[PDB]
C-alpha cells in the first residue's frame, strides 16, 4: 500500500534560561527511526530503529549537519517572529515544522509537505502543487515574499519529488521486515456490572500495526452511537497500538450488541458478541 516519510521538529524559546530547545524526530509511517535533541550531550542524529543502523558514517554526518543547521535557522526564526509580532522576550514561544513525502505501492511520488506552525497555529505551508505558499497572517506574508524571491518552493519540490521519495524507498527495504508488516488486532471483550441494572461492555483491539483502525458498536445489526465511549488509539511501547470501545448496556440485553473491527491486517472484518 502507501507509505509516508515525515520529519517533525519543535523549537521552544527559554527566556532568561539560555538557547532554545530543539527536538526533531523522523518517521516512516507509524514507526519512528531517528531523533535529534539540541540539549543532548552527543550532538548527533541518533538511530531510533534497528533498520537504520545499517547506514554508513556519511549518512550520520550529513543528517547531523542538516538537522543541526535547521536548529540554528529556527532559533533565528523565533527571534524574527518576536519582532514581527512585537512580543515580549519574557514569554516562551514554540515553532513547529512538518516535512515529508507520500508514495504509492509501486514506489512513486504521491504527495509532499512542508509547513510551519507558530505557537500551535498554522504559519506557512507549501500548497499541494508545491509551487506556492499559504501565509496565515500579515506576519507570514513577509516570510512568503522572502521565500518566493528566493525560490524555496522550487528547491523543496525538487527534494520532495526526488531525494525524499528515493530516501523513502531505500528505508522501506533496509527495514522491510519492520515496515511492510501488517499485524492484525488481537481482539476480545469484557463486561463490567455498573449497577444491578446496567453494565459496561468493552471491546478491545490489541497489538496491531499500523495505527489506523475502526471500532463500531451495533444493536441488532443496526448502528449505535448513544452511550458509547471510544478512547484514543495508543502506543503499546513495542511498535504496536491499542484501542478500545465501550457501551453502557441494560442488564439482560448484552447479546443484542455486536462489536465491529476493521484493520488492514484483517483478511476479513471481525464481529464480537458477548
Amino acid at each position: 500500500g502507501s507509505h509516508s516519510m515525515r520529519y517533525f521538529s519543535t523549537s521552544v524559546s527559554r527566556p532568561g534560561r539560555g538557547e532554545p530547545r530543539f527536538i526533531a524526530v523522523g518517521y516512516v509511517d507509524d514507526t519512528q527511526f531517528v531523533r535529534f535533541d539540541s540539549d543532548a550531550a552527543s550532538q548527533r542524529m541518533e538511530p531510533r530503529a534497528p533498520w537504520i543502523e545499517q547506514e554508513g558514517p556519511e549518512y550520520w554526518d550529513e543528517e547531523t549537519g542538516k538537522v543541526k543547521a535547521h536548529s540554528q535557522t529556527d532559533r533565528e526564526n523565533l527571534r524574527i517572529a518576536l519582532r514581527y509580532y512585537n512580543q515580549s522576550e519574557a514569554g516562551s514561544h514554540t515553532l513547529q515544522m512538518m516535512f515529508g513525502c507520500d508514495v504509492g505501492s509501486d514506489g512513486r511520488f504521491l504527495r509532499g509537505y512542508h509547513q510551519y506552525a507558530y505557537d500551535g497555529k498554522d504559519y506557512i505551508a507549501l500548497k499541494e502543487d508545491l509551487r506556492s505558499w499559504t501565509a496565515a497572517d500579515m506576519a507570514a506574508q513577509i516570510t512568503k515574499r522572502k521565500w518566493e524571491a528566493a525560490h524555496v518552493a522550487e528547491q523543496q519540490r525538487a527534494y520532495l519529488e526526488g531525494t525524499c521519495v528515493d530516501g523513502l524507498r531505500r528505508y522501506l527495504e533496509n527495514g522491510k521486515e519492520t515496515l511492510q508488516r501488517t499485524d492484525p488486532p488481537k481482539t476480545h471483550m469484557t463486561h463490567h456490572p455498573i449497577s444491578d441494572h446496567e453494565a459496561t461492555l468493552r471491546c478491545w483491539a490489541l497489538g496491531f500495526y499500523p495505527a489506523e483502525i475502526t471500532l463500531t458498536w451495533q444493536r441488532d445489526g443496526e448502528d449505535q452511537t448513544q452511550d458509547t465511549e471510544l478512547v484514543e488509539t495508543r502506543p503499546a511501547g513495542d511498535g504496536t497500538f491499542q484501542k478500545w470501545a465501550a457501551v453502557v448496556v441494560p442488564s439482560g440485553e448484552e447479546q443484542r450488541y455486536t462489536c465491529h473491527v476493521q484493520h488492514e491486517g484483517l483478511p476479513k472484518p471481525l464481529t464480537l458478541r458477548w
Binding site: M45, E63, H70, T73, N77, H114, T143, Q155, Y159, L168
Partner: peptide, 10 residues
C-alpha cells in the same frame, strides 16, 4: 533524508 533548510529564514 532531513530537508535542506538553508533558505527557511522567516
Amino acid at each position: 533524508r532531513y530537508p535542506l533548510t538553508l533558505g527557511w529564514c522567516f
